[PDB]
């Protein structure tokens, strides 16, 4: 009774194909439950899951296509600007997902690419050093906390010069919230350490070498919290930036119908529910019940209007413009040093 909406012509052509190749940035141990469940629905499809860095996905896909080689059927990546760039340059199979009828226009590049997640950039902290009631939930509040001598060298955030996702998140913050400028200068005052990776930042918070990290995905925070009871999460109430992992089907898929079934599964309530519940990846689909969901996120930030979803839109390509990049990085480097 929860099987994704299927075109019978598509399921029958997927049987003949009987294979699916995925290039994905989602860690395989996070995706596993979805792969196993997809196979229970479509046990006639053999999956090749390639778990790759977001740059690897873009380079590898661009290479194979250009050399004319067989590449991925489906590309699934948290690098929104690179996915949107490929899908707006002829790399994407146009396909109207029957599971995406209620997707907001800003969660889909028409029929070229789809959001699969709505993941908030949050504050994480070490509850042995900071109690929940003293962790501010606004940029101005965090800027105030970081004036305290006890916070000097105790703060982590992204290095937007070494992380594409870190860039997306901090740039969205800078473009949307004036108070971000005060907070960036406070990272300077506090001698914030910058990280190219969520895991390197989280390790230092768990160790107590930092007490607080700003701008990391709630999905990773929740996943680590399962293991680590001293990890606190605070949601920003003056405005939260959310990233959307983008999926699209290769225009040249060898198995385009298998890729439609998997894209439909990723978007369905069955797939979105399993992703939220088992992977603790914040779902896109608003009907999912549980902690890693739009409803839970909206209650935590004080309403839907306080979440800015980075859109699945060619408008985000301004982030790749050298002049725009430079203006942001010029401000950033001046403020945080």
Shortest Å distance, C-beta 203 to Na ion: 37
Closer residue to Cl ion in complex, CB, 108/224 = 224
Q: Does 116 bind Na ion (CB under 5 A)?
A: no
Shortest Å distance, C-beta 72 to Cl ion: 21
User: Shortest Cβ contact with Cl ion: which residue?
Assistant: 198
The HSE-up count of residue 157 (CA atoms within 13 Å, CB side) is 27
Size of the site for Na ion (CB under 5 A): 6
**Which is nearest to 163 in space by CA: 192, 196, 193?**
196
Is 88 annotated in some ligand binding site? no
Q: Which does 287 bind (CB under 5 to 8 A by kind): Na ion, Cl ion, none?
A: Na ion
Closer residue to Na ion in complex, CB, 30/273 = 273
Closer residue to Cl ion in complex, CB, 126/168 = 168
φ, ψ for residue 293, nearest 5 deg: -140, 160
DSSP designation for 159: -
Contact 47, 20 (CB under 8 A): yes
- Dig out the tokens for 237 from the structure: 């109430």
Shortest Å distance, C-beta 274 to Cl ion: 22
Site for Na ion in 257-276 (CB under 5 A): 261, 264, 269
Q: Which does 97 bind (CB under 5 to 8 A by kind): Na ion, Cl ion, none?
A: none
Q: Which does 269 bind (CB under 5 to 8 A by kind): Cl ion, Na ion, none?
A: Na ion
Q: Which does 198 bind (CB under 5 to 8 A by kind): Cl ion, Na ion, none?
A: Cl ion
Site residues for Cl ion per CB under 5 A: 197-198
- Cα dist from 225 to 203, 230, 246, 268, whole Å: 12, 8, 25, 26
**Which is nearest to 284 in space by CA: 104, 94, 86, 65?**
104
Shortest Å distance, C-beta 293 to Na ion: 12
How many angstroms separate the CA atoms of 131 and 106, rounded?
37
Q: How would you classify the pairing of strands 119-126 and 240-243?
A: antiparallel
Burial zone of 124 (CB within 10 Å; 0-12 exposed, 13-18 middle, 19+ buried): buried
Is 25 annotated in some ligand binding site? yes
How many angstroms separate the CA atoms of 258 and 80, rounded?
23
Among 147, 287, 330, 334, binds Na ion (CB under 5 A): 287
Where does this chain bind Na ion (CB under 5 A)? Answer: 4, 6, 261, 264, 269, 287
| Binding site, annotated residues for Mn(2+) | 27
């Amino acid at each position: 009774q929860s099987r994704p909406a299927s075109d019978p012509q598509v399921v029958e052509a997927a049987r003949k194909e009987g294979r699916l190749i995925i290039y994905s940035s989602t860690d395989q141990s996070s995706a596993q439950a979805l792969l196993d469940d997809f196979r229970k629905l479509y046990p006639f499809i053999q999956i090749e899951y390639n778990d790759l860095g977001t740059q690897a996905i873009y380079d590898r896909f661009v290479s194979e296509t250009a050399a004319g080689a067989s590449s991925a059927d489906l590309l699934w990546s948290s690098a929104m600007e690179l996915q949107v760039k490929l899908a707006s340059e002829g790399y994407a199979l146009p396909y109207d997902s029957p599971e995406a009828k209620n997707w907001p226009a800003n969660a889909r590049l028409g029929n070229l690419a789809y959001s699969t997640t709505l993941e908030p950039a949050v504050v994480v902290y070490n509850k042995r050093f900071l109690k929940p009631e003293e962790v501010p939930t606004t940029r101005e509040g965090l800027a105030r906390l970081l004036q305290e001598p006890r916070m000097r060298g105790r703060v982590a955030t992204w290095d937007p010069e070494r992380s594409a996702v870190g860039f997306t998140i901090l740039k969205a913050d800078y473009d949307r919230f004036p108070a971000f400028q005060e907070l960036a200068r406070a990272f300077g005052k506090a001698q914030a350490a910058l990280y190219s990776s969520t895991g390197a930042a989280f390790e230092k918070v768990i160790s107590g070498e930092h007490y607080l990290a700003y701008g990391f995905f709630g999905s990773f925070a929740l996943l680590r919290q399962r293991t680590v009871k001293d990890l606190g999460i605070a949601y920003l109430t003056d405005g939260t930036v959310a990233i959307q992992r983008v999926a699209f089907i290769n225009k040249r898929a060898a198995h385009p119908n298998a890729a439609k079934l998997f894209l439909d599964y990723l978007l369905s309530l069955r797939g979105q529910n399993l992703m939220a519940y088992t992977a603790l990846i914040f779902a896109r689909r608003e009907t999912v019940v549980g902690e890693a969901t739009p409803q839970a996120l909206y209650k935590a930030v004080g309403g839907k209007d306080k979440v800015y979803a980075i859109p699945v839109s060619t408008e985000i390509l301004k982030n790749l413009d050298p002049a725009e990049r430079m203006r942001f990085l010029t401000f950033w480097r001046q403020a945080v040093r």
